[PDB]
Every structure is written in C-alpha cells, then in structure tokens.
Enzyme design. Structure first.
Site, mmCIF file in Angstrom:
data_model
loop_
_atom_site.group_PDB
_atom_site.id
_atom_site.type_symbol
_atom_site.label_atom_id
_atom_site.label_comp_id
_atom_site.label_asym_id
_atom_site.label_seq_id
_atom_site.Cartn_x
_atom_site.Cartn_y
_atom_site.Cartn_z
ATOM 1 N N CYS A 65 0.828 -1.196 0.000
ATOM 2 C CA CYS A 65 0.000 0.000 0.000
ATOM 3 C C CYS A 65 0.870 1.256 0.000
ATOM 4 O O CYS A 65 1.810 1.354 0.800
ATOM 5 C CB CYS A 65 -0.927 0.009 1.216
ATOM 6 S SG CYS A 65 -1.791 1.575 1.467
ATOM 7 N N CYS A 99 -6.382 1.373 7.360
ATOM 8 C CA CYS A 99 -5.995 2.128 6.174
ATOM 9 C C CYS A 99 -7.141 2.143 5.168
ATOM 10 O O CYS A 99 -7.719 3.202 4.912
ATOM 11 C CB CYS A 99 -4.721 1.553 5.552
ATOM 12 S SG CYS A 99 -4.084 2.524 4.167
ATOM 13 N N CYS A 130 -4.686 3.937 -7.078
ATOM 14 C CA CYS A 130 -4.199 3.463 -8.365
ATOM 15 C C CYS A 130 -2.832 2.812 -8.189
ATOM 16 O O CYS A 130 -2.080 3.138 -7.267
ATOM 17 C CB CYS A 130 -4.117 4.620 -9.361
ATOM 18 S SG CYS A 130 -3.439 4.188 -10.978
ATOM 19 N N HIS A 142 -9.953 9.321 -9.370
ATOM 20 C CA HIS A 142 -9.272 8.856 -10.570
ATOM 21 C C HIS A 142 -10.208 8.403 -11.681
ATOM 22 O O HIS A 142 -9.732 8.135 -12.790
ATOM 23 C CB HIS A 142 -8.328 7.698 -10.210
ATOM 24 C CG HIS A 142 -7.162 7.549 -11.135
ATOM 25 N ND1 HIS A 142 -7.203 7.930 -12.459
ATOM 26 C CD2 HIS A 142 -5.920 7.052 -10.926
ATOM 27 C CE1 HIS A 142 -6.036 7.676 -13.024
ATOM 28 N NE2 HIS A 142 -5.239 7.143 -12.115
ATOM 29 N N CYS A 184 -3.569 8.654 -15.542
ATOM 30 C CA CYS A 184 -2.652 9.113 -14.504
ATOM 31 C C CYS A 184 -2.148 10.523 -14.781
ATOM 32 O O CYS A 184 -1.946 11.304 -13.844
ATOM 33 C CB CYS A 184 -1.478 8.143 -14.371
ATOM 34 S SG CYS A 184 -1.945 6.474 -13.853
ATOM 35 N N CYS A 242 -11.164 58.134 1.563
ATOM 36 C CA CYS A 242 -11.135 57.531 2.886
ATOM 37 C C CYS A 242 -11.580 56.070 2.815
ATOM 38 O O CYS A 242 -11.881 55.525 1.748
ATOM 39 C CB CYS A 242 -12.013 58.321 3.853
ATOM 40 S SG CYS A 242 -13.777 58.256 3.482
ATOM 41 N N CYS A 281 -10.938 46.619 7.661
ATOM 42 C CA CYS A 281 -11.318 45.360 8.289
ATOM 43 C C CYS A 281 -12.475 44.658 7.589
ATOM 44 O O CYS A 281 -12.804 43.527 7.963
ATOM 45 C CB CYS A 281 -11.683 45.593 9.759
ATOM 46 S SG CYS A 281 -12.950 46.855 10.025
HETATM 47 ZN ZN LIG Z 1 -12.850 49.119 10.094
HETATM 48 ZN ZN LIG Z 2 -2.941 0.815 3.240
HETATM 49 ZN ZN LIG Z 3 -3.302 6.326 -11.960
#
Ligand SMILES: [Zn+2]
Ligand SMILES: [Zn+2]
Ligand SMILES: [Zn+2]
Ligand SMILES: [Zn+2]
Ligand SMILES: [Zn+2]
Lengths: 76, 173
Positions: free
Chosen positions: B6, B29, B34, B44, B49, B89, B104
C-alpha cells in the site's frame, strides 16, 4: 486556453482565449457574452489590476484561471 | 502475479498483473489507490494518470491565484460584489447601498466606525482602537499578496523535492 471570468452579477462565464490575446481582446470577448461595455470593465487577476496594454501571458494567466470583474470605487 | 505494498501504510496484498486498483486490506488504512501512479482511486475515475496529475496541479495553482485575489478584493457583505478603492477615505459605499470599512471589511453604518484623531500615517492611536479613516493599505496588502506567492513557492519545493518552482501570479515590477 479556457479561462473563467466572474461577472459583477455573480455569474461565472467561460472564455476560449490564447496566451497571446491582449486584455483588450478579452474585454471584447466579455462584451460579446454578457453585453458589458469594455470601458466599464475593471479586471483583476491574482490580486493585480489588468491593463489594456499587456497580454494574458504578461500577467501569467494560465488555463482555468479566473479573472474577477470588480467595481473601482472612490472612498467617502 | 505481483505483490504490492500500500502506498500509504505499506501493508502488502497479492494483485493480478492486469488489475490497476489497489484495495488495502489494512482495517485502519482501507485506502483504494491506483497502482501505476499511487493516485486516489475515487478521484481517478475517467482520468488517466497524467490527467489526474494535471487536475490536482491546476486545483492547487488556482487556489493560490484566488488566495491572492482575495487579499486585494473587498466583497460586499450584501451582494457579494468585489470592490477596490481608487482613492479617498476607508468608508466604502457599494452600488447596493451597503457600507463597509475598507480596512477590516466589516459592515458599517457611517463614519462613527472610524478613528478621526490626529494620527501619523500607519501609526497607532493613543486614544482609541477604531480603524483609521485615511490609512492606505495598498502597500500592506501587496506585501500579504507577495507572502502568498512566496509561501506557495516554498510549498512547491516540499512536494516536488528539488528547488523547482514556478510563479503562480503575475511577475514583479
Ligand atoms: Zn474598520
Ligand atoms: Zn494501506
Ligand atoms: Zn493512476
Ligand atoms: Zn453590494
Ligand atoms: Zn483615534
């Protein structure tokens, strides 16, 4: 390429552009799809304002990047 | 016939040499990956790929491009329209009528939100903590925007392994 443009109205449109197209060409293609006049369009990519003189490759605009139409307002 | 480990937890499993989907037997896991590119199997489907590698890259680059635009843009709290201050301003009035503090970005009702005392450019106020009415945040914002591009440059060095990095946003002046 294929890039996205976000309208003031909130809608996101898609454009077929090439990295050699100038900003004026893009503002035209935006007018054809949404009717927004090019003199009214304030374009911003990656935090930087786009100017009519340079091209898409000058601003490093690649595939599926998004250009934001914004309002350039005066404070008060 | 081939024995595969894996890509995540290294648990081993026997796989036919004509099967590309690896299903980890490890109960803790369980990742399905792939076998040629170790990509995630769910992400995928319908892609090769190479098409998956490009898709995750574009996803990352655009995430940084929008992270930079977000630092520059002020979004109206009512209509969501992006604003930028040309001059004046820090009290912004969107075309929908709603008002916001350009510093802000909170929604405000008038000038009472702002500090109007005598105050040097980019200096604290010794009598309040309200936002400066006149401070221009253009330099500070351009620094934040560049920090995003630099941090994205260094997170590319971690994933790629070498000191290879391509700029995400527009170049420098
Ligand atoms: Zn302000
Ligand atoms: Zn695994
Ligand atoms: Zn692949
Ligand atoms: Zn608004
Ligand atoms: Zn004050």
């Amino acid at each position: 390429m294929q890039i996205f443009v976000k309208t003031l109205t909130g809608k996101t449109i898609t454009l077929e552009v090439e990295p050699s197209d100038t900003i004026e060409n893009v503002k035209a293609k935006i007018q054809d799809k949404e009717g927004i006049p090019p003199d009214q369009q304030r374009l911003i990519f990656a935090g930087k304002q786009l100017e009519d003189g340079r091209t898409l490759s000058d601003y490093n605009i690649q595939k599926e990047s998004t250009l934001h139409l914004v309002l350039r307002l005066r404070g008060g | 016939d081939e024995l595969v480990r894996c890509p995540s937890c290294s648990f081993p499993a026997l796989l036919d040499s004509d099967v590309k989907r690896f299903s980890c037997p490890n109960p803790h896991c369980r990742k399905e990956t792939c076998r040629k590119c170790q990509g995630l199997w769910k992400e995928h489907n319908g892609l090769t790929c190479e098409e998956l590698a490009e898709k995750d890259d574009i996803k990352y680059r655009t995430s940084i491009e929008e992270k930079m635009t977000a630092a520059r843009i002020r979004k109206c709290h009512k209509c969501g329209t992006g604003l930028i201050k040309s001059e004046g301003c820090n009290r912004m009035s969107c075309r929908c009528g709603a008002q916001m503090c350009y510093l802000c970005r909170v929604s405000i009702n008038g000038y009472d939100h702002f500090c109007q005392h005598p105050r040097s450019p980019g200096a604290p106020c010794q009598e309040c903590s309200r936002c400066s009415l006149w401070t221009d945040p253009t330099e500070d914002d351009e620094k934040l925007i560049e920090e995003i591009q630099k941090e994205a440059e260094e997170e590319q060095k971690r994933k790629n392994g070498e000191n290879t990095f391509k700029r995400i946003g527009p170049p420098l002046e």
